[PDB]
Write a protein that binds this ligand. Structure first.
Ligand SMILES: *[C@@H]1O[C@H](CO)[C@@H](O[C@@H]2O[C@H](CO)[C@@H](O[C@@H]3O[C@H](CO[C@H]4O[C@H](CO)[C@@H](O)[C@H](O)[C@@H]4O)[C@@H](O)[C@H](O)[C@@H]3O)[C@H](O)[C@H]2NC(C)=O)[C@H](O[C@@H]2O[C@@H](C)[C@@H](O)[C@@H](O)[C@@H]2O)[C@H]1NC(C)=O
Ligand SMILES: *P(=O)(OC(C)C)OC(C)C
Length: 591
């Protein structure tokens, strides 16, 4: 966040509408909020909007200010779970992180043990925040969500950031988030929702509702790496967020030190207590696998360092001990070294950062479509920064499995990119106070910049309409407006993109209807530009539209005939008038 915003072309110097921005309330459903964080400072803030109706649960060591003007909790079912606390207070850290990502104010020198140093901020530092705590160690219940929504709607929230939801895509018909968001939409309130972290398989996203803006997690240029240097003098580049200073320690293999009743067939991975604690103490264990902080304590208490392995390393995480996830080969290279001189040694360095030019690429865990409820309503809808995002953290909240004196943490997930979209959507809202949820969501989609299908073969079912563009989202020129009155043919649903399910090698011919509403003051003509593959034929009538002014609408029909042989084939439509550009992806699937 000390870097994502700049990576999105959203500088500290972007123009603002401070007056409207300061009167906007961003409701955040998550694990609560930690009031004390610098990201939620009050200084200078005028008093809350007169038309705000929310309140604050201040009977248990919590206090709202003029930044955080609302805070409530929901555990309707049974009693509070173990380790949790009564009230709006965030003890998990998830809600605090999320809130600062979307609306956190400027905090300089923001850093996690030096890592990611910079100026932390939210997309809208002046908006007010209203926290609705609905997630516990107990989980997040359906009753709490519906209830929290109700309050948000009546309190007067303007937009809602929802970083929860990952149920089996097939349980989509019994998902409450669709109920809440729907009622929210009827009152002109948009919802940003993380797609899920169940990728990369072809049908892992559970954020299926149409009125819901779904967001996937992509990378940014900045990348955390941890250099490991074994005895020979050769280095390897591993990923992890290592805050421990550079140190040197003896090396050992999991196979060489099995534990009573274990075979080296499981010791390799040194998991499930398959390693003798005695011959492990004070050394950097080398294991053929990748596990979390829990397994560190469970199986490796005593070890001074850990070296893991994985074929996937497009994101980093912090651990309880000097650690680093190496590439399969660099691992074998390290193992040989162990059986070489017999008395090895490696030095795990404190993480550093490289710049990856391929970014933004949607990360591996990001849930991807098609929409299991309707393959013709493509999802995700868009992408944003969700890998290694540094933002506000509670002082009591553990980091990577231990305690660290830090006010910021670095974590990844679709729940990190959602807040980004939430903040950007609020920004657009500050400039276009009257647009509806579908209008705001359209702006961000039609104005998103195209992503590379060579990096993410799944095309749209991985990044939807592409990567967000904050400043172009403000003046989209035209919008695919809608409202609950339209969710009562699927291909004729005024969506910002087009989808179509087909059978392998089987000529087809579909047609789609849409209506664009102008949001720009000046009249202008928008000629159309298509870009379809080979085995397909696409056209649009009209292919030229004029708009006399603000409000005017026009329709058109898109036809798609052809026959794809592969799984996913994409094309695009674009309605430019010179100044404005309005692209809408076109996806065809063989499932
Ligand atoms: C700069 O960022 C890019 C984007 O994340 C890094 O490229 C990715 O690196 C990961 C990590 O190893 C690769 O993961 C393996 O992926 C394969 C196949 O799945 C991937 O590729 C196919 C075809 O392109 C797609 O259909 C999939 O959606 C997916 O993208 C899988 O079998 C393995 O089990 C791993 O999961 C990933 O493929 C790769 N994606 C892209 C777009 O290239 C890049 O990492 C470098 O390049 C990769 C290929 C490895 O050689 C890494 O070791 C390199 O570091 C990163 N570069 C730097 C400097 O960090
Ligand atoms: P986010 O990515 O939220 C999803 C589970 C919806 O989760 C964090 C804890 C990584």
């Amino acid at each position: 966040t000390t870097r994502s915003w700049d990576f999105l072309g959203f500088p500290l110097t972007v123009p603002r509408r401070s007056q409207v921005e300061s009167n906007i309330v961003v409701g955040v459903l998550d694990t609560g909020i930690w009031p004390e964080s610098p990201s939620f400072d009050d200084e200078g803030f005028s008093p809350p909007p007169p038309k705000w109706k929310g309140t604050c649960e201040t009977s248990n060591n919590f206090r709202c200010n003029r930044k955080i003007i609302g805070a409530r909790s929901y555990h309707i079912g049974r009693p509070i779970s173990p380790g949790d606390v009564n009230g709006p207070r965030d003890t998990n850290g998830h809600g605090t992180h999320t809130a600062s990502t979307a609306a956190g104010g400027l905090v300089s020198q923001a850093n996690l043990y030096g890592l990611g140093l910079g100026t932390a901020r939210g997309g809208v530092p002046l908006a007010r925040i209203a926290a609705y705590k609905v997630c516990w160690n107990d989980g997040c219940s359906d009753t709490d969500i519906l209830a929290a929504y109700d309050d948000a709607i009546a309190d007067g929230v303007d937009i809602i950031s929802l970083s929860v939801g990952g149920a089996n895509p097939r349980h989509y018909f019994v998902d409450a988030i669709a109920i809440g968001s729907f009622h929210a939409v009827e009152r002109g309130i948009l919802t940003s929702n993380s797609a899920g972290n169940g990728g990369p398989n072809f049908f892992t996203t559970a954020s299926l509702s149409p009125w819901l803006l779904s967001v996937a997690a992509s990378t940014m240029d900045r990348k955390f790496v941890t250099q490991v240097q074994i005895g020979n003098g050769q280095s390897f580049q591993g990923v992890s967020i290592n805050t421990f200073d550079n140190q040197y320690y003896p090396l050992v293999s999991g196979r060489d030190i099995p534990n009573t009743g274990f075979d080296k067939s499981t010791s390799r991975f040194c998991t499930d207590k398959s390693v003798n604690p005695n011959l492990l103490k004070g050394k950097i264990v080398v294991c053929e696998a990748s596990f979390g902080p829990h397994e560190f304590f469970k199986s490796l208490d005593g070890a001074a360092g850990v070296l893991m392995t994985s074929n996937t390393r497009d994101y980093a995480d912090s651990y309880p001990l000097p650690s680093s996830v190496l590439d399969p080969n660099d691992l074998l290279a390290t193992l040989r070294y162990i059986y070489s001189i017999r008395s090895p040694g490696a030095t795990i360095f404190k993480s550093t950062t490289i710049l990856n030019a391929s970014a933004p690429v949607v990360v591996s865990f990001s849930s991807r479509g098609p929409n299991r409820a309707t393959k013709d309503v493509i999802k995700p809808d868009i992408s944003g920064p969700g890998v290694e995002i540094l933002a506000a953290w509670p002082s009591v909240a553990p980091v990577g499995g231990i305690r660290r004196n830090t006010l910021f943490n670095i974590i990844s997930g679709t729940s990190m990119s959602c807040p980004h979209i939430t903040g950007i959507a609020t920004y657009v809202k500050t400039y276009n106070p009257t647009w509806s949820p579908a209008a705001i969501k359209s702006a961000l989609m039609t104005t998103a910049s195209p992503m590379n299908a060579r990096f993410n073969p799944q095309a749209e079912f991985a990044y939807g309409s592409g990567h967000v563009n904050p400043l172009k989202a403000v003046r989209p020129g035209l919008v695919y407006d809608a409202n609950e009155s339209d969710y009562v043919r699927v291909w004729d649903l005024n969506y910002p993109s087009f989808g179509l399910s087909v059978s392998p090698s089987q000529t087809f011919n579909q047609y789609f209807n849409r209506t664009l509403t102008s949001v720009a003051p000046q009249a202008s003509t928008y000629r159309a530009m298509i870009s379809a593959p080979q085995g397909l034929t696409i056209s649009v009538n009209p292919n030229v539209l004029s708009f006399n002014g603000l409000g005017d609408r026009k329709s058109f029909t898109l036809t798609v005939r052809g026959s794809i042989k592969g799984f996913v084939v994409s094309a695009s439509l674009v309605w430019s008038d010179g100044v404005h550009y309005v692209r809408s992806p076109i996806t065809i699937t063989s499932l």
